[PDB]
PDB file of C-alpha atoms in Angstrom:
ATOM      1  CA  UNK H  16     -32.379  51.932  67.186  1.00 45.26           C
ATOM      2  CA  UNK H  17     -33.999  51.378  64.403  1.00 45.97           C
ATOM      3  CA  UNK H  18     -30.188  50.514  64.354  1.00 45.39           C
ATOM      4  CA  UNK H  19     -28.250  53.331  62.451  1.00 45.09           C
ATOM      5  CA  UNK H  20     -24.693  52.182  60.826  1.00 46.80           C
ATOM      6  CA  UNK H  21     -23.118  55.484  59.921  1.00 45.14           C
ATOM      7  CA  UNK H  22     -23.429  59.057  57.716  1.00 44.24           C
ATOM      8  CA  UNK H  23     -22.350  59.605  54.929  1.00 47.56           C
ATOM      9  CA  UNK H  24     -20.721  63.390  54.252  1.00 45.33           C
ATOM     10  CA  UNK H  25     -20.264  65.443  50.969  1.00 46.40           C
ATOM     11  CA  UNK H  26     -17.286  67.263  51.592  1.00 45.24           C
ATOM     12  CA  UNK H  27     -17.312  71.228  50.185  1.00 46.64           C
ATOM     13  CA  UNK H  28     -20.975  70.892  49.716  1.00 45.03           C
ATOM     14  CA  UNK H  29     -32.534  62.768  47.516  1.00 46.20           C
ATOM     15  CA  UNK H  30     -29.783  65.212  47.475  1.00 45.28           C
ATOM     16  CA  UNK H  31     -28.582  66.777  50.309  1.00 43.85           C
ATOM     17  CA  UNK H  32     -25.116  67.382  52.327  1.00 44.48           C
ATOM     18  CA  UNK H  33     -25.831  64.399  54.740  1.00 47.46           C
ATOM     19  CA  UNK H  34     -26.930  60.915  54.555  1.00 51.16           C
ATOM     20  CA  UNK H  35     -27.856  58.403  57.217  1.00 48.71           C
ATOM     21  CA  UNK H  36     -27.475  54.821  56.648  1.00 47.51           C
ATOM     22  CA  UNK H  37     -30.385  52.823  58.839  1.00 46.87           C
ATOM     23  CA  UNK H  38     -30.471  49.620  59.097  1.00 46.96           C
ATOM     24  CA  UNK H  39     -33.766  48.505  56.703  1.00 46.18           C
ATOM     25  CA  UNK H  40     -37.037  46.921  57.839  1.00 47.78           C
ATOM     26  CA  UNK H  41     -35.967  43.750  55.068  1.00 48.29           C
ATOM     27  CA  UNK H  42     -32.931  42.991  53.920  1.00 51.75           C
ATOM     28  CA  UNK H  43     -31.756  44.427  50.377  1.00 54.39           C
ATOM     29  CA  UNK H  44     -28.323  42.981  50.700  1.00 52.76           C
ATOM     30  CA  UNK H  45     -26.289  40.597  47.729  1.00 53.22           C
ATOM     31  CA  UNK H  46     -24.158  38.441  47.275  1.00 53.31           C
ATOM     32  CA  UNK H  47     -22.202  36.586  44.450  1.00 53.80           C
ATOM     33  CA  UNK H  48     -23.645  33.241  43.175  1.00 51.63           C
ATOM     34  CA  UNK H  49     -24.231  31.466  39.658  1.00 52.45           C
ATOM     35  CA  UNK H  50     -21.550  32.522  36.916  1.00 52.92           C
ATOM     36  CA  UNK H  51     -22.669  32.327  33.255  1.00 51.41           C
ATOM     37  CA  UNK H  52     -21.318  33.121  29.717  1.00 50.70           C
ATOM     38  CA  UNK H  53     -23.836  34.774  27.595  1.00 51.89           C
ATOM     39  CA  UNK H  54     -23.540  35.030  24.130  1.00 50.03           C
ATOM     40  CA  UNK H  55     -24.891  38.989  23.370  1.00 50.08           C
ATOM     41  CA  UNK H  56     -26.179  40.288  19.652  1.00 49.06           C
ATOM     42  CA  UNK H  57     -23.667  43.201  18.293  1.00 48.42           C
ATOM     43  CA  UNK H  58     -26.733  45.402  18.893  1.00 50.11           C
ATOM     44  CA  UNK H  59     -27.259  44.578  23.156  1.00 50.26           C
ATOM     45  CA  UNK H  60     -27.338  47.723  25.319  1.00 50.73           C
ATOM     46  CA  UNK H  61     -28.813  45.748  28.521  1.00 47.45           C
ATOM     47  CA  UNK H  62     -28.724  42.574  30.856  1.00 46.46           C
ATOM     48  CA  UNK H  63     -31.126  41.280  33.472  1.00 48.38           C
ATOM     49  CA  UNK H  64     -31.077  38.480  35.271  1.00 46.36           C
ATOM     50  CA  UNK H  65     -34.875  37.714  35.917  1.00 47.43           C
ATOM     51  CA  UNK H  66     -35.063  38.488  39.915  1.00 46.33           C
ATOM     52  CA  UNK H  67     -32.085  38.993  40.243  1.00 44.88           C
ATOM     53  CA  UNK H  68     -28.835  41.525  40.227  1.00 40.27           C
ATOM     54  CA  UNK H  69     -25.865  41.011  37.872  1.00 38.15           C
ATOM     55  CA  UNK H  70     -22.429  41.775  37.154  1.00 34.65           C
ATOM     56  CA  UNK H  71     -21.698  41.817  33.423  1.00 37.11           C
ATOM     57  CA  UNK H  72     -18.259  41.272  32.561  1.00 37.25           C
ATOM     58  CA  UNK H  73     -17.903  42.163  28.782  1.00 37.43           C
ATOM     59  CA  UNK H  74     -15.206  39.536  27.248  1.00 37.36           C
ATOM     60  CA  UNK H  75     -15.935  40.692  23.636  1.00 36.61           C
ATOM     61  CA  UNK H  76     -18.640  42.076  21.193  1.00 37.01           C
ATOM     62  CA  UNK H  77     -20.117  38.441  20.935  1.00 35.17           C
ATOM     63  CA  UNK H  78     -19.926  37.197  25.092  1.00 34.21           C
ATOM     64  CA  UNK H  79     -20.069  38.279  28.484  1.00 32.25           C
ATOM     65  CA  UNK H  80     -19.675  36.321  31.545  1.00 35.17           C
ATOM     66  CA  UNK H  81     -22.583  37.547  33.632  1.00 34.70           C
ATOM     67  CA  UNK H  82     -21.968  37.221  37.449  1.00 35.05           C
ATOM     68  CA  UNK H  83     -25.748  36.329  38.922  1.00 35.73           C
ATOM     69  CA  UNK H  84     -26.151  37.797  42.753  1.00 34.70           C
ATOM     70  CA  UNK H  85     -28.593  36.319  45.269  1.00 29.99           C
ATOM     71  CA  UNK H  86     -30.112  37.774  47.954  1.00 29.68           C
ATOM     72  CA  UNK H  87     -27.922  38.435  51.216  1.00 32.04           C
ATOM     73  CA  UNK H  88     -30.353  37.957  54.240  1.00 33.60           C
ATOM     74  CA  UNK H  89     -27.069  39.354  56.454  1.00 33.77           C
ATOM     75  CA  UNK H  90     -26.309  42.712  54.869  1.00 34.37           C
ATOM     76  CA  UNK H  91     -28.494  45.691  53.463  1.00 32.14           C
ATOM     77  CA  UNK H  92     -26.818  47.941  50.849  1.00 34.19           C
ATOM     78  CA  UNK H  93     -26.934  51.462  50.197  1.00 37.05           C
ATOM     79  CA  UNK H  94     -25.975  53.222  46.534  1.00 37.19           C
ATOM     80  CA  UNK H  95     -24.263  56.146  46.100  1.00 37.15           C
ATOM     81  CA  UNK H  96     -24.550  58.174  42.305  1.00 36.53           C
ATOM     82  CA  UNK H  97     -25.352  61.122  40.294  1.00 38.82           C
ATOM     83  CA  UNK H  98     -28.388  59.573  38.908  1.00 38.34           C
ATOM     84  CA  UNK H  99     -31.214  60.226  39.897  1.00 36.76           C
ATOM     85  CA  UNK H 100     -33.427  57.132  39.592  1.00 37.96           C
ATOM     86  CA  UNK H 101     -34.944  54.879  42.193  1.00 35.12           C
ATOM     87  CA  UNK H 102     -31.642  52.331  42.836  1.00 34.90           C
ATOM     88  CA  UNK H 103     -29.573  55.302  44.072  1.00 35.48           C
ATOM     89  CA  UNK H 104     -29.980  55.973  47.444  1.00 32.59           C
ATOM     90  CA  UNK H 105     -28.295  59.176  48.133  1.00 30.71           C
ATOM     91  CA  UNK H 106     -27.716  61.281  44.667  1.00 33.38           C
ATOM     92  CA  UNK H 107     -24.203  63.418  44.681  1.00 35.38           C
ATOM     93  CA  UNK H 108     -23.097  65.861  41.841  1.00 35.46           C
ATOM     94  CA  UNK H 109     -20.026  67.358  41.058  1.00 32.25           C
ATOM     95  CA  UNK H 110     -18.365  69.689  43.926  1.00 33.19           C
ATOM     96  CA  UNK H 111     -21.864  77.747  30.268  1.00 32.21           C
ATOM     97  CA  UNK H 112     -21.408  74.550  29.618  1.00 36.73           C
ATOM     98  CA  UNK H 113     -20.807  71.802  32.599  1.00 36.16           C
ATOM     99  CA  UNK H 114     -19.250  68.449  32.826  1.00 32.84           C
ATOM    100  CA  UNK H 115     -19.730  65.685  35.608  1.00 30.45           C
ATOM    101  CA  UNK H 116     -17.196  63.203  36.387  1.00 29.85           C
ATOM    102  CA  UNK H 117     -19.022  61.109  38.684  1.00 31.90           C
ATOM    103  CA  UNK H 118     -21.049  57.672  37.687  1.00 32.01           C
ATOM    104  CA  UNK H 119     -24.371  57.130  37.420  1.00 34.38           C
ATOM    105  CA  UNK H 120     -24.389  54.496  39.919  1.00 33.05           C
ATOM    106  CA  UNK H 121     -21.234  54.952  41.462  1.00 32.44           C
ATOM    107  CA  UNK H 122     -20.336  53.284  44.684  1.00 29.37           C
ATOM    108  CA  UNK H 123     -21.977  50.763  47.095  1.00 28.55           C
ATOM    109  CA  UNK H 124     -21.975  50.585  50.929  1.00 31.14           C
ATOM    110  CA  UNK H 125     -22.509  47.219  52.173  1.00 33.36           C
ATOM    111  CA  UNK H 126     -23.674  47.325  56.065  1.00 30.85           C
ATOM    112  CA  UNK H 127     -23.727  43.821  58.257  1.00 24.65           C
ATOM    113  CA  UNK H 128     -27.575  43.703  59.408  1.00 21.84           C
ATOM    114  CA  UNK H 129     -26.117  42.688  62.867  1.00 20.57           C
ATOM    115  CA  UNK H 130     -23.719  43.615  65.598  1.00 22.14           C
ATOM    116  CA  UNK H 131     -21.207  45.353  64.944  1.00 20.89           C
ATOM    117  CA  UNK H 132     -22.583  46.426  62.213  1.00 20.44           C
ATOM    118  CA  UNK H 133     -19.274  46.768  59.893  1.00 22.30           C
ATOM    119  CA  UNK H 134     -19.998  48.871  56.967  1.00 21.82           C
ATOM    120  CA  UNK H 135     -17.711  48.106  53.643  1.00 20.80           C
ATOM    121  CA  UNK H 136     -17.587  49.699  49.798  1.00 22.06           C
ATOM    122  CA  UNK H 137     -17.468  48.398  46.563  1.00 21.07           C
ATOM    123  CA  UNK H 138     -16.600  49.881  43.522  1.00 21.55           C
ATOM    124  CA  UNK H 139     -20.262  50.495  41.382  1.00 22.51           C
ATOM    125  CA  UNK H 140     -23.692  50.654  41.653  1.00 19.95           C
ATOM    126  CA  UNK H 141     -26.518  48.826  39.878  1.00 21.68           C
ATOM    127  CA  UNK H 142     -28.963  50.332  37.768  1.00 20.20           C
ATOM    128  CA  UNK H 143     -32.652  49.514  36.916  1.00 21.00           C
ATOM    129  CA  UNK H 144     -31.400  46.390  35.402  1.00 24.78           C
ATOM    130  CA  UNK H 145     -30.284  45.685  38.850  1.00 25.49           C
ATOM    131  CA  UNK H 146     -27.089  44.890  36.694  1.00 23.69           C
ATOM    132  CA  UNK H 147     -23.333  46.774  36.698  1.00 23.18           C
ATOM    133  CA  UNK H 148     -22.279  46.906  33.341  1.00 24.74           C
ATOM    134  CA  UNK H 149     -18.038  45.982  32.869  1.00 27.45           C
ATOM    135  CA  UNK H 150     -17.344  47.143  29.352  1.00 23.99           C
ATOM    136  CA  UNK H 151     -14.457  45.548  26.918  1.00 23.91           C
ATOM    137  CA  UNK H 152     -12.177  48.611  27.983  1.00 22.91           C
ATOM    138  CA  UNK H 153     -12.833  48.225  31.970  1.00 24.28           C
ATOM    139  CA  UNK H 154      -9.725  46.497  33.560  1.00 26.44           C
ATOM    140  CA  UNK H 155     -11.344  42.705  34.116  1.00 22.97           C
ATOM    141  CA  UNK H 156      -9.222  39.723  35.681  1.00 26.03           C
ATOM    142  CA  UNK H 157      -9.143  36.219  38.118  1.00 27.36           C
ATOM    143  CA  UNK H 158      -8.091  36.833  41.147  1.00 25.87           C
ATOM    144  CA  UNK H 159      -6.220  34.475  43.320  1.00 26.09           C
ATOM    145  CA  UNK H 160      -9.445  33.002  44.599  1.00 30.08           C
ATOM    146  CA  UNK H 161     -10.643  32.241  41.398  1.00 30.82           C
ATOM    147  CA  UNK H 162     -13.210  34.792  41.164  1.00 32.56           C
ATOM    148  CA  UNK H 163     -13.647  37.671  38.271  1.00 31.21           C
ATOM    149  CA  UNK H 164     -13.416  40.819  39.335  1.00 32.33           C
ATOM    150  CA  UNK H 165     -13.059  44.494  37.727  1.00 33.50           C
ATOM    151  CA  UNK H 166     -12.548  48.290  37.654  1.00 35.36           C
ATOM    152  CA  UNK H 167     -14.974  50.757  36.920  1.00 37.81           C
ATOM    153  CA  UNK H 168     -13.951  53.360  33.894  1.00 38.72           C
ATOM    154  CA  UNK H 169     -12.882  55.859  36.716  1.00 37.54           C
ATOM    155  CA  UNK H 170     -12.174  53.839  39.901  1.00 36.76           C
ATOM    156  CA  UNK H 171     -13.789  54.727  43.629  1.00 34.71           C
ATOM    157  CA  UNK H 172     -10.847  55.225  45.690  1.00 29.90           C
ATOM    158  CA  UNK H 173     -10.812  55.127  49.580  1.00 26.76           C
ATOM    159  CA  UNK H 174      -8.186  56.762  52.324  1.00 27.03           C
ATOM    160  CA  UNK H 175      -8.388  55.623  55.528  1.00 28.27           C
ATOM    161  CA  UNK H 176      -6.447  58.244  57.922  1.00 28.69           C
ATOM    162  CA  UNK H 177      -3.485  57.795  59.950  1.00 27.09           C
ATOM    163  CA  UNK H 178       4.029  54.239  62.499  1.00 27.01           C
ATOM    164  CA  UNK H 179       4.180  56.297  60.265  1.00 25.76           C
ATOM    165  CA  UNK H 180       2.913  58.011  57.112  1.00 27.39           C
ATOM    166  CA  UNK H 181       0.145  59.626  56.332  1.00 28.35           C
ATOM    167  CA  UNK H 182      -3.215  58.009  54.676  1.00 23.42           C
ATOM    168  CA  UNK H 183      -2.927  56.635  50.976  1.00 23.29           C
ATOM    169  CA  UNK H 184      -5.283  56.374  48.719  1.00 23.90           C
ATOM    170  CA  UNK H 185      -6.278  53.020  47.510  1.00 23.66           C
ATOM    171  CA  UNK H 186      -8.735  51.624  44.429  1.00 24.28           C
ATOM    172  CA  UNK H 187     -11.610  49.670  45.566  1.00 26.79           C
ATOM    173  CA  UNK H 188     -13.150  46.819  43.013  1.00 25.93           C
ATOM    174  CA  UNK H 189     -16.054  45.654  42.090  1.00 26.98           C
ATOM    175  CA  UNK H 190     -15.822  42.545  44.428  1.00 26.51           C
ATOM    176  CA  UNK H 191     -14.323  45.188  46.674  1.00 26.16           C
ATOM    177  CA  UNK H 192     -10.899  44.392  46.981  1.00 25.31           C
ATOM    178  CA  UNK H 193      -7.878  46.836  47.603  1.00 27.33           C
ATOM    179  CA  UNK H 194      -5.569  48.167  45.032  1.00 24.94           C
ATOM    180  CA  UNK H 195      -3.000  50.998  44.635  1.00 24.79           C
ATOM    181  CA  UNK H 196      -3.496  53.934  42.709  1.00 23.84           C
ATOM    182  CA  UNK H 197      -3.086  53.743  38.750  1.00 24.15           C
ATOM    183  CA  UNK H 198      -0.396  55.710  37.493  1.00 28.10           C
ATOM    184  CA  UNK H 199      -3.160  58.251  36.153  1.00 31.98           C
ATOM    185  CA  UNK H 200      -6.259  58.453  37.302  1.00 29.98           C
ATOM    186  CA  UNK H 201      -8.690  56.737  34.577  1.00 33.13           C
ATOM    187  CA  UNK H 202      -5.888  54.402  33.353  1.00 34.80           C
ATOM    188  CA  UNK H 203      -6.454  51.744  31.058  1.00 32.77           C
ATOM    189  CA  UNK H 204      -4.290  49.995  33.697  1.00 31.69           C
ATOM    190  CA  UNK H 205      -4.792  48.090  37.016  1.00 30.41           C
ATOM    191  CA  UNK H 206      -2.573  48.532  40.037  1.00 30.27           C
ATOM    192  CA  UNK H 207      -1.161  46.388  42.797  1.00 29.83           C
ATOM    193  CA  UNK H 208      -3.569  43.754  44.845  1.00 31.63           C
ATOM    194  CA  UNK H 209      -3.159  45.147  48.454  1.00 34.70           C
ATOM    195  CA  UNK H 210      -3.599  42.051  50.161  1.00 36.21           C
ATOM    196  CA  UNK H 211      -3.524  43.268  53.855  1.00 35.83           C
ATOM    197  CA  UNK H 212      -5.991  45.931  53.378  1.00 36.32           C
ATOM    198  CA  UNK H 213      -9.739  45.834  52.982  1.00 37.97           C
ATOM    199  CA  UNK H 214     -12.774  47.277  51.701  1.00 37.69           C
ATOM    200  CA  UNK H 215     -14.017  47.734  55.540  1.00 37.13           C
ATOM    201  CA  UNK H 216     -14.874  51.649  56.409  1.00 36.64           C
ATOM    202  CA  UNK H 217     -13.251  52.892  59.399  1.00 36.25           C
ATOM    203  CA  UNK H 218     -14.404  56.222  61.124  1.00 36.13           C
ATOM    204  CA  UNK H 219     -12.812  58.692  59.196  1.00 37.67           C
ATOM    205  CA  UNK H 220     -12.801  57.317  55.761  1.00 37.31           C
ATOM    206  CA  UNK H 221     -12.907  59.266  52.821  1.00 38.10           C
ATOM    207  CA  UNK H 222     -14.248  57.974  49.577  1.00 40.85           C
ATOM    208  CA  UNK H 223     -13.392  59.487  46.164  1.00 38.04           C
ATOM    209  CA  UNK H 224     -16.128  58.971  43.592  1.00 39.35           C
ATOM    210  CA  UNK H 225     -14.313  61.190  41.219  1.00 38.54           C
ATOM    211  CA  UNK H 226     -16.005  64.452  41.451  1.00 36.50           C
ATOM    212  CA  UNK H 227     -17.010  64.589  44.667  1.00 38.38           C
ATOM    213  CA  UNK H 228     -14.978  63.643  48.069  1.00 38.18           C
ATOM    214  CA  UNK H 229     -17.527  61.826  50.888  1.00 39.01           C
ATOM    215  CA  UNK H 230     -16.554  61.160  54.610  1.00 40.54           C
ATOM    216  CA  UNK H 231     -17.802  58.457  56.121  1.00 41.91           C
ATOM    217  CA  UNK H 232     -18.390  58.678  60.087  1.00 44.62           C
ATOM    218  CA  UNK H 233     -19.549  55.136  61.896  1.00 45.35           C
ATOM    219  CA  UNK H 234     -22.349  55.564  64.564  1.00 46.92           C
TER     220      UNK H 234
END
């Protein structure tokens, strides 16, 4: 206390084993707020929204409908990714030649700034755009709320442990809604809205950022 939220663990292996989410001295945290349709050249490779993050949903070559997100006095976030520059809090790598299947910027925890603290994931990180790119392939929809939401290329997928079976895994959004698994993993293919489930982290959770498996263990 400074408050601490949770740890974050790399299971079978700044980069390290262990993270520590603390609560920040100033709120980072975001949240959704003006939606616009841009029209893009055939030649854009980046976004911005001046001061602000973004999530770019790519409708076509010629327009995106760019999600603007405001500052969240409530929450602070933490990012999760194999990249190594300055938005990614805690940098992962995969557990001759090598291949990684994890994301640049792959995953977001969201943590409430005040009591109790609930900690929840979404799907993506930004990059130093402060914008999470949604490209024509990436599974893109309305939801019943009205609201655009998406899939990353490879999904973040969540299990919370366990009447009377045991855990399933579950696909986490963008917005950070629940899903069920795709019928292959990397799918051009959503699955089914889990409406009685969230994006909340229990004790216990493990998240799958496809290449690495993290446990998540609340304070």
């Amino acid at each position: 206390e400074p408050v601490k939220y949770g740890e974050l663990v790399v299971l079978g292996y700044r980069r390290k084993s262990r993270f520590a989410l603390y609560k920040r001295p100033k709120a980072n945290g975001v949240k959704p707020s003006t939606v616009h349709m841009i029209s893009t050249p055939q030649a854009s490779k980046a976004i911005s929204c001046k001061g602000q993050h973004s999530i770019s949903y790519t409708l076509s070559r010629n327009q995106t409908v760019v999600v603007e997100y405001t500052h969240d006095k409530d929450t602070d976030m933490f990012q999760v990714g194999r990249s190594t520059e300055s938005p990614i809090d805690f940098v992962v790598t995969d557990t001759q030649i090598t291949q990684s299947t994890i994301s640049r910027f792959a995953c977001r925890i969201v943590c409430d700034r005040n009591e109790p603290y609930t900690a929840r994931i979404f799907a993506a990180g930004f990059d130093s755009s402060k914008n999470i790119f949604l490209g024509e392939k990436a599974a893109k929809w309305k939801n019943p709320d009205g609201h655009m939401d998406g899939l990353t290329t490879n999904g973040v997928l969540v299990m919370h442990p366990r009447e009377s079976q045991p855990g399933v895994w579950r696909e986490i959004s963008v917005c950070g809604d629940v899903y069920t698994l795709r019928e292959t993993r990397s799918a051009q293919q959503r699955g089914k809205m889990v409406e009685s489930e969230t994006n909340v982290l229990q004790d216990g959770s493990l998240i799958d950022l496809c290449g690495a498996t993290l446990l998540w263990r609340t304070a």
